[PDB]
Design a protein around this ligand. Structure first.
Ligand SMILES: Cn1cnnc1Sc1ccccc1NS(=O)(=O)c1cccc(Cl)c1O
Length: 358
């Protein structure tokens, strides 16, 4: 690790860990295409297990970038189209409010007010059908963005239906395996449980619990090394040998909607680089990121812009993650922590690091 990288990373992350009381953290910087790794603290405070480059963290909503790319791969395979009605893949969805709601709307949170969470009362699949049938939009499709697991989660589930594969099976065979993400899991296998960090919420060790559409919206667990490889793959999609996957990655970074200075991709969110750091820092506060905001359609979508800050924040009850990269600079960062700490602290740290290296 070049001393410049070592210095900027430690000078930024050390105070962050102290200020936020983060039990364990892993960081990867991608600089001129090569990864550099940093670890601090504890994956398991009780058993005194350190964070290592093999520790698994819950990605929370960074999982949506995998769902977005898997959907993009399905488009590239010709199995689905973003301009297809939701009811083409779920014929049982007969309620008339679904007329005009497309897979694009589901993938980009623009269906008209689908809620942030699937109600915990929904367990069975007939519960899920009932929930979506009875849901009443607040807005017409394609007019307002409201960040929602019930939106992109349904997209992920529907996008794999023509393949006949389960969501987890599709993700493993079409995304994880081709990219050699061999320590990235929807369900952590017994063989890897020793590497699975505990999350910490108010001092209690916690793991994410099962829920409806959890795999599609917030269910991936990964190591810092696999996540660095995920960033490298999205920084340089053309190096990828599987044709539909290379195409799907590009599709997930296309710009479909604009609100303020942010653009909505499939999972990924993008801003023009150079960014105003106060825009992404304040913009990452959940108060703005989770608010209902009017969108302007980008007709047709802009293909992946190299001069972009591309990023996604993620959280679970016990974890906080952040990924960001700049394709034009060959530059990227991954931050994984086993405490959910405020988003603006994440983006501030990441911008301080990448700004110093560009
Ligand atoms: C649903 N559920 C049940 N058990 N665990 C979960 S996930 C979870 C739990 C607690 C906080 C955040 C999440 N993740 S989230 O809903 O996707 C999300 C919302 C808003 C912002 C982000 Cl950055 C984000 O990740």
């Amino acid at each position: 690790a070049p001393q410049q990288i070592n210095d900027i990373v430690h000078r930024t992350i050390t105070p962050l860990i102290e200020q936020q009381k983060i039990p364990g953290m892993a960081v990867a910087v991608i600089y001129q295409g090569k990864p550099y790794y940093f670890t601090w603290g504890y994956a398991d405070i009780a058993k005194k297990q350190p964070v290592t480059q093999q520790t698994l963290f819950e990605l929370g909503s960074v999982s949506k970038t995998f769902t977005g790319v898997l959907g993009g791969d399905a488009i590239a395979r010709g199995e689905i189209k973003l301009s297809d009605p939701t009811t083409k893949y779920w014929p049982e969805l007969t309620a008339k409010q679904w007329n005009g709601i497309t897979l694009l709307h589901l993938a980009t949170y623009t269906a008209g007010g689908l809620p942030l969470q699937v109600p915990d009362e929904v367990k069975s699949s007939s519960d899920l059908l009932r929930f979506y049938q009875n849901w009443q939009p607040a807005w017409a499709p394609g007019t307002q963005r409201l960040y929602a697991n019930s939106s992109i989660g349904l997209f992920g589930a529907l996008a794999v239906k023509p393949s006949g594969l389960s969501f987890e099976q599709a993700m493993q065979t079409r995304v994880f395996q081709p990219l050699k993400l061999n320590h990235t899991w929807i369900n952590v296998p017994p063989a890897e449980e020793k590497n699975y960090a505990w999350g910490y919420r108010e001092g209690k060790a916690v793991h994410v619990s099962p829920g409806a559409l959890d795999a599609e919206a917030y269910g991936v667990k990964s190591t810092i090394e696999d996540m660095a490889r995920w960033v490298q793959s999205n920084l340089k999609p053309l190096d990828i040998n599987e044709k539909t996957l290379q195409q799907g990655i590009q599709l997930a970074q296309s710009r479909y909607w604009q609100t303020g200075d942010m653009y909505q991709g499939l999972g990924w969110e993008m801003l023009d680089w150079p960014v105003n750091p106060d825009s992404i820092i304040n913009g990452s506060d959940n108060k703005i990121a989770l608010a209902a905001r009017p969108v302007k359609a980008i007709t047709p979508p802009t293909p992946a812009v190299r001069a972009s800050w591309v990023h996604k924040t993620g959280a679970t009850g016990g974890f906080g993650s952040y990924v960001a990269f700049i394709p034009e600079k060959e530059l990227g960062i991954v931050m994984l922590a086993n405490k959910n700490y405020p988003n603006p602290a994440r983006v501030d740290a990441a911008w301080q690091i990448l700004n110093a290296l560009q």
